[PDB]
Amino acid sequence: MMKRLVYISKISLSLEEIQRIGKVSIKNNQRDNITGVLLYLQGLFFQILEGENEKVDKLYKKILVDDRHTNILCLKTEYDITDRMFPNWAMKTINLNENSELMIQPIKSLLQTITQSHRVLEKYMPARVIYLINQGINPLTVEPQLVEKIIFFSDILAFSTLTEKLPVNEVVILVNRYFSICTRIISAYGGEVTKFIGDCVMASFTKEQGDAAIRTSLDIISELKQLRHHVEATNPLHLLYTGIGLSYGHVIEGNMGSSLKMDHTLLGDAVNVAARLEALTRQLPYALAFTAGVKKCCQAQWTFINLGAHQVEAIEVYTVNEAQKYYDTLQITQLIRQTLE
Amino acid sequence: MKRLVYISKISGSLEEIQRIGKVSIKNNQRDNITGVLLYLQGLFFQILEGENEKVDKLYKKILVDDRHTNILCLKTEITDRMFPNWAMKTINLNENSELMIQPIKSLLQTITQSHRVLEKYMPARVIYLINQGINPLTVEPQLVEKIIFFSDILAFSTLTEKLPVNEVVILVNRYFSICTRIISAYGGEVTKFIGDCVMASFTKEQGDAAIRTSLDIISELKQLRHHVEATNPLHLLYTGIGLSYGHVIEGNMGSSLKMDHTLLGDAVNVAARLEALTRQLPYALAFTAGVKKCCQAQWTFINLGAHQEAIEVYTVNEAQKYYDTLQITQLIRQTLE
Ligand SMILES: Cc1cc2nc3c(=O)[nH]c(=O)nc-3n(C[C@H](O)[C@H](O)[C@H](O)COP(=O)(O)O)c2cc1C
Ligand SMILES: Cc1cc2nc3c(=O)[nH]c(=O)nc-3n(C[C@H](O)[C@H](O)[C@H](O)COP(=O)(O)O)c2cc1C
Numbered sequence A: 001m002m003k004r005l006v007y008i009s010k011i012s013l014s015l016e017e018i019q020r021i022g023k024v025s026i027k028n029n030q031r032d033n034i035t036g037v038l039l040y041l042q043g044l045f046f047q048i049l050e051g052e053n054e055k056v057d058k059l060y061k062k063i064l065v066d067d068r069h070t071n072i073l074c075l076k077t078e079y080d081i082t083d084r085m086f087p088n089w090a091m092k093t094i095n096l097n098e099n100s101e102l103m104i105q106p107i108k109s110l111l112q113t114i115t116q117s118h119r120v121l122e123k124y125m126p127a128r129v130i131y132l133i134n135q136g137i138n139p140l141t142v143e144p145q146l147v148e149k150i151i152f153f154s155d156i157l158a159f160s161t162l163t164e165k166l167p168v169n170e171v172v173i174l175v176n177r178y179f180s181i182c183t184r185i186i187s188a189y190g191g192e193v194t195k196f197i198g199d200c201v202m203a204s205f206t207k208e209q210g211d212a213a214i215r216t217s218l219d220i221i222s223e224l225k226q227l228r229h230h231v232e233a234t235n236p237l238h239l240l241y242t243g244i245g246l247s248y249g250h251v252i253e254g255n256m257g258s259s260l261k262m263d264h265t266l267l268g269d270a271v272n273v274a275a276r277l278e279a280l281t282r283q284l285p286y287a288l289a290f291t292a293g294v295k296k297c298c299q300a301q302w303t304f305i306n307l308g309a310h311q312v313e314a315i316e317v318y319t320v321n322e323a324q325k326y327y328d329t330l331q332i333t334q335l336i337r338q339t340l341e
Numbered sequence B: 001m002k003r004l005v006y007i008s009k010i011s012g013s014l015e016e017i018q019r020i021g022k023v024s025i026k027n028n029q030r031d032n033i034t035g036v037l038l039y040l041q042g043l044f045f046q047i048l049e050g051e052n053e054k055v056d057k058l059y060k061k062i063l064v065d066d067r068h069t070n071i072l073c074l075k076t077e078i079t080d081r082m083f084p085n086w087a088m089k090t091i092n093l094n095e096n097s098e099l100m101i102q103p104i105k106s107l108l109q110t111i112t113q114s115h116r117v118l119e120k121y122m123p124a125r126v127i128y129l130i131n132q133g134i135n136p137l138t139v140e141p142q143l144v145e146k147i148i149f150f151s152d153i154l155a156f157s158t159l160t161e162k163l164p165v166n167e168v169v170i171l172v173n174r175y176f177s178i179c180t181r182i183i184s185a186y187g188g189e190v191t192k193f194i195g196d197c198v199m200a201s202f203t204k205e206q207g208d209a210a211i212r213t214s215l216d217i218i219s220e221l222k223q224l225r226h227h228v229e230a231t232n233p234l235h236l237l238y239t240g241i242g243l244s245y246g247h248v249i250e251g252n253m254g255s256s257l258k259m260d261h262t263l264l265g266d267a268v269n270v271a272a273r274l275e276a277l278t279r280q281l282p283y284a285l286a287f288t289a290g291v292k293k294c295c296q297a298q299w300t301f302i303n304l305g306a307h308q309e310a311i312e313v314y315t316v317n318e319a320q321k322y323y324d325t326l327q328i329t330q331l332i333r334q335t336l337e
């Protein structure tokens, strides 16, 4: 059984260094009955690989960690190929920058144009769809799956007051900083941010990442606390606080929409509960609020704190002792408004 | 001078192709226009270059040509022509089997087909920007006056509790498909789906289009509920719609780890709140006074009082529910028992 892979990447690199890739590739691909082509053009690599499923996969894992390229995207995988596309070529390297033949110029220009455009579109794609494509899965074909998820929601305290008083550029700087911190920490704990909705960050963890979701939440709150006293009191970042809600439930995860517009969405009750628990933190002495189901997913010896039943009928709300606000929330929102007067 | 590159989907023969090339060569010679037309696996690629007012004069006619569909202009740029000798060189890349070109041909095909998939996930604003020759990654966020639209599915948690997953997915896809088609038909821009919610925007000149979008959606769902049998889950599909108006910052937001087109501002939150509020109203549509002020048509506006500082909520008479929402939510659950 044989498969064929095509990927693109960003060149990180001397002309003689690329020759060394060709040299080694030809040797290894001959031994392993792998065939294919490597092209390069205006700082991008294009490679097609084909051969026995297992030898191709071992090579691709190796290519994934090669530091001579970054931002690798496997565009297409074919699983039960009958013929090789390049049966004579262990690894043929083609420098398309070198080809100035007039009849190849249109195709060369179009490949560069469409691939650069493709690379821009990738930046707006959701991580989960990027993952599916990388795994050889048709996002337009795969069925959504019911999965057990911890939903994470966070947003900026008194964000309407920030947007009312601050210039547009300052708001953007602040929001970008907030999104950067949240995204880096969520991703470091193995979570996936799903969307930004206004100033809100929506993310998800698996049922085995209960403690990681609490740690992520506590780490975000901690980094904002550091940031607020790192900056001068006139920097808008001095005013940046967050609240976080977590929920746990069955959600349907997948690609939804029509041929006119697709998106990657999570469907289910847990989404709205986590959002509502996020909003509830504004009137709690804790910056983090979550459901009994989230507590059930935790293994670590947190000092859980029962905050009673709250209408979202009414459910129990929990937090942990580390999430206690060192401040009174209403005074902070008034202080935020006075600072920008 | 100007140079355009676009792609397009061929809409369902050699001598018809030849007519495009023959007639293009004549006009492009007349207009001093040069370029190349490539086709491959049902896709057109074309590059056009020439004096500014000459090429876009021809691109407007290419746009409304019936022989291709889903036209995306990928690039707009000029000192020197790229194809000075070709009024229009047509290249059928399907019927070239030369061995050294099949690598480039296969990459062109795979990346373009992949590009067409990614296009479907983009914010409408980004697709609009690319089409207008502007790279969306380098636009700085701008404060714009927008009408924000939120719609979601009534009693959706009951539907998700009772229906098989695949039936939920068919139902949500139908809903999204209806909302997206109509929003886009009225010139609105869908920005994202969030759970079962559709988020979209309209400009301040589109107050009446925003209300008409909302009523068309409600009206199509009402048609659909009696088109299908009472055992089809689409028999149970209702929406509520919230609209707000305000200053919002639109643009790229995030970091290298995750970036996205976002809308920031109170109007976003207000529209979602008013969408949720329709549950407790005799009307499936609620909007602010600012949306009302954006409307030129003689709607029968109905003032529904202030709601939590409080804000005034309006609707139109045509948005009145013929049902009572509590009974309907109970009916949905009972039906699914
Ligand atoms: C763009 C690119 C393409 C590559 N293609 C191949 C290839 O086709 N076959 C191969 O053996 N190595 C390829 N390599 C390099 C391998 O990842 C790796 O550096 C080396 O070949 C294996 O080292 P090893 O002999 O210790 O296993 C490629 C590297 C880059 C950057
Ligand atoms: C893919 C495609 C590419 C085309 N390219 C050109 C072109 O480059 N120049 C041109 O005059 N017409 C081109 N046409 C055809 C125009 O849409 C239209 O048929 C033509 O301009 C008719 O000219 P007329 O105003 O004399 O009727 C193209 C059509 C298609 C479907």
Ligand SMILES: [Ca+2]
Pocket (backbone or CB within 6 Å): A155, A156, A157, A158, A159, A160, A199
């Ligand atoms: Ca906020």
Ligand SMILES: [Ca+2]
Pocket (backbone or CB within 6 Å): B152, B153, B154, B155, B156, B157, B196
């Ligand atoms: Ca809903």
Ligand SMILES: [Cl-]
Pocket (backbone or CB within 6 Å): A180, A181
């Ligand atoms: Cl930081």
Ligand SMILES: [Cl-]
Pocket (backbone or CB within 6 Å): A300, A301, A302
């Ligand atoms: Cl701990």
Ligand SMILES: [Cl-]
Pocket (backbone or CB within 6 Å): A302, A303, A304, A320, A321, A322, A323
């Ligand atoms: Cl604790």
Ligand SMILES: [Cl-]
Pocket (backbone or CB within 6 Å): A196, A197, A198, B261, B262, B263, B264
């Ligand atoms: Cl947004």
Ligand SMILES: [Cl-]
Pocket (backbone or CB within 6 Å): B297, B298, B299
């Ligand atoms: Cl009217």
Ligand SMILES: [Cl-]
Pocket (backbone or CB within 6 Å): B299, B300, B301, B316, B317, B318, B319
């Ligand atoms: Cl009316």
